[PDB]
């Protein structure tokens, strides 16, 4: 009966909680001590990237570790060369409302997505002079929130329909769909080995998904509010995510219990984006107060602060080789640090 | 600093010129957020779809109405994309009263939102003739029985208005309510002079004239 099924679900929740508690023999805070703290680190704005004139929402370092991409209500994606601080490409977007952008690992394609409900794939490095639109991905009723590239033909997209999807770009149809989430899905992160990927949603939950067969292997909760952004640890066996509760959380895939909560009394509203460094010790998060913070992933204390922008720090990204961090903020100016 | 870089910088400067030209062209636009509820007369303003964007030219000005009803999602996570909108055309039908309480809730939510704490509202009271025809048959007392008072034509409209401004606690957010004349094509003038005011007081407070 239905009541029996609800009772079984509650018993399964109790079993999950008991297994997590018994498996949580200790916490990393008890063993992270007796080590050298990272200490005070100041990052100065090595380069300021100007040219945009609207709300910068998303950026993505390419595998080249030099080129980057950016989006706004400028009506156009722009691909920039970070070293010489000049913009290589200016793709005119079909819809001015874009909430996420991704740069392919091969550098051949770029992806944009937003409230238009369609994922646009633009093909760089074409025989034509200009950047043409390679493909349009439709099928998500909710607004797109985060897209990433697995290969040049496989793209992972999280939308506003509380569902994630994996698309074959050549065919243009959803290779597979993930509907475990209840609330709206905000941000997906691909694993370093491209074997798994996590997605944090509006129900204060982050769900792991296998790339091919695609059932929710793992589900982590503990946030008091909406999850805004997610990112794997470089090892691939952990991931940290930020929420509107002005805290970040670090989860491990092999142990369901969350490891650390990064929070300070000064911050009152939520994180907008997170990313990790090459060593994984330095977690960089774009906070509420037009400011970005740099947390020691093991000491769980604010290692450093970044100079503020004129508006909210919507996105930040650590480059592939870990040479620099680029923060894009609502003030239409990007900043590359070191 | 070799020849290929110099040509790359020239290409970058050309792209900068195109970007600034596009920005100058877009600066002439005025962004209006068209909100409301279901069957609230969204389409009467001019005369998988995430956003219904409409554009029209009037008195040497180009207005963009971002009529969004297809989201059906959590407004708290996508409404900040409309933070920089000149005005909120929050059209409300008056004949139907039902969704009047939920429309008032919506208005309370949107008016006190942190992003729109200072953005003004061009409140539209649609379906005046039908509301006047139906008020005599059914006294307003069904909706807001506390101080419905008389069932008079203009008294009911005044009470509904006063209820709408009462939901605003922002000191510097004037609500330019216009009692929409059913489906007659005159909304352009009130939109234009309301937005002209919005710019006027925006500049006045921008210059620290206080």
């Amino acid at each position, epitope marked *: 009966e239905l009541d029996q099924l609800r009772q079984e679900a509650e018993q399964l929740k109790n079993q999950i909680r008991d297994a997590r508690k018994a498996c949580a023999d200790a916490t990393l805070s008890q063993i992270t001590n007796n080590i050298d703290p990272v200490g005070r680190i100041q990052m100065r704005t090595r380069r300021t990237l100007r040219g945009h004139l609207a709300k910068i929402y998303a950026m993505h370092w390419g595998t080249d570790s030099r080129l980057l991409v950016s989006a706004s209500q400028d009506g156009k994606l722009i691909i920039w060369d970070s070293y010489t601080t000049n913009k290589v490409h200016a793709i005119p977007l079909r819809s001015s409302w874009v909430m996420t952008c991704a740069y392919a690992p091969s550098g051949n394609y770029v992806a944009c997505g937003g409230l238009d409900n369609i994922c646009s794939i633009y093909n760089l490095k074409t025989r034509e*002079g200009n950047v043409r639109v390679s493909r349009e991905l439709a099928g998500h009723t909710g607004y797109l929130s985060c897209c990433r590239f697995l290969d040049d033909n496989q793209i992972v997209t999280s939308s506003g329909d509380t569902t994630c999807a994996l698309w074959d770009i050549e065919t243009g149809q959803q290779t597979t769909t993930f509907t475990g989430h209840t609330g709206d899905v905000m941000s997906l992160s691909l694993a370093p080995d491209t074997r798994l990927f996590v997605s944090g949603a509006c129900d204060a939950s982050a769900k792991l998904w296998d790339v091919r067969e695609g059932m929710c292997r793992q589900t982590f909760t503990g946030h008091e509010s909406d999850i805004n952004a997610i990112c794997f640890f470089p090892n691939g066996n952990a991931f940290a995510t930020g929420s509107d509760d002005a805290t970040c959380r670090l989860f491990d895939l092999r142990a369901d219990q969350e490891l650390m909560t990064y929070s300070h009394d000064n911050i009152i509203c939520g994180i907008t984006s997170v990313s990790f460094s090459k060593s994984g010790r330095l977690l960089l998060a774009g906070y509420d107060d037009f400011n970005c913070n740099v947390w020691d992933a093991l000491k769980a204390d604010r290692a450093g602060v970044l100079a503020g922008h004129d508006n909210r720090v919507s996105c930040l990204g650590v480059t592939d080789d870990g040479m620099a961090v680029a923060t894009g903020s609502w003030d239409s100016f990007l900043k590359i640090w070191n | 600093l070799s020849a290929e870089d110099k040509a790359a910088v020239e*290409r970058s400067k050309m792209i900068e010129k195109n970007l600034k030209e596009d920005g100058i062209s877009a600066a002439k636009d005025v962004k209006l957020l068209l909100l409301g509820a279901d069957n609230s007369g969204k389409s009467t303003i001019v005369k998988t779809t995430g956003i219904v964007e409409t554009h029209f030219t009037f008195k040497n000005l180009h207005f963009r109405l971002f009529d969004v009803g297809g989201q059906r999602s959590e407004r708290k996570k996508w409404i900040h994309c409309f933070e920089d909108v000149t005005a909120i055309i929050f059209c409300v039908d008056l004949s139907d009263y039902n969704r009047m309480h939920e429309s008032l809730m919506l208005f309370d939510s949107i008016c006190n939102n942190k992003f729109f704490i200072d953005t003004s509202i061009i409140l539209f009271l649609n379906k005046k003739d039908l509301f006047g025809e139906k008020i005599k048959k059914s006294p307003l007392t069904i909706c807001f029985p506390e101080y419905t008072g008389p069932n008079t034509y203009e008294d009911a409209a005044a009470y509904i208005q006063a209820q709408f401004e009462s939901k605003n606690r922002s000191p510097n957010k004037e609500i330019y309510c216009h009692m929409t004349c059913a489906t007659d094509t005159n909304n352009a003038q009130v939109i234009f002079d309301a937005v002209t005011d919005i710019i006027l007081q925006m500049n006045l407070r921008e210059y620290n004239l206080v």
Partner: single-chain antibody
Amino acid sequence: VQLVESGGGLVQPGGSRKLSCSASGFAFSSFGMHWVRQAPEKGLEWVAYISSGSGTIYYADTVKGRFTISRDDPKNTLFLQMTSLRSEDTAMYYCVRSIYYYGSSPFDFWGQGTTLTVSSDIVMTQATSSVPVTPGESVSISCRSSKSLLHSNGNTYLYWFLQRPGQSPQLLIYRMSNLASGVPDRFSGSGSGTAFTLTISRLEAEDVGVYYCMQHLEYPLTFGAGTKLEL
């Protein structure tokens, strides 16, 4: 991508002539353009260059002052006004396109060219004139520069071109290491300082022709002598 030329033929010395490159099939307005000529017996030599949007215009020392180049984006055309023709001006002219950004491939596509007959810095040294080969085994072609081509950056501005008999040249290697698009993997460029070498492993047919070694670090653009490769 088509770059058909027009406006050539017999002409008296000291006359005037207009050369038209009617580009089609690509974004002409975003592409820098070059005119490169080759004597009937000698190798390639640069003539003129116009940047994107007519921002920058260059000429060769023999070309300077005597010739002019002007693009027309609305109709996708490239005009070379050709004044005071001399006997040495007789050559085949190729209209070339090239876009300069990070990672781009300049001189990727060459036009068919046209013949113009007249009635009567950096020097590229190719230490070879002809190399007898057989299909199936690797070959190496060497090139030398007046000074180091390794700029302040990590890239060395060396380009390799192949010209089959009766065919317009095509790009093989740009910046001395990157292989051009649409080119078989067999070709591989590698250089150090002033000594450069293009290696063709598993040489097959359709490789007979002239190999040209160009520099791009600084203007003017100077080609090599041109190593002939037969059999």
